[PDB]
Amino acid sequence: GSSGSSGPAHFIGRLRHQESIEGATATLRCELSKAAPVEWRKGRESLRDGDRHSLRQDGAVCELQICGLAVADAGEYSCVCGEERTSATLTVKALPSGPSSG
Q: Please report the DSSP string for the chain in residue order.
A: --SS---S---SS----EEEETTS-EE--EE-SSS---EEEESS----SSSS-EEEE-SSEEEEEESS--TTT-S-EEEE-SS-EEEE-EEEE----PPP--
1 occurs within a structural domain: no
Is 52 domain-assigned? yes
Rounded Cα distance, 55 and 65, in Å: 7
**Any idea of the CA torsion for 65, 49, 39, 43, to the nearest 10 degrees?**
60
Distance CA 100, CA 59 (A): 44
Domain containing 47 equals: 8-95
Q: Is residue 101 part of a domain?
A: no
How far apart CA 92 and CA 70 sit, in angstroms, is 7
Q: Does 21 reside within a domain?
A: yes
The answer to whether 14 and 86 have CB atoms below 8 angstroms apart is yes
Beta bridge partners of 41: 78
Solved with: NMR
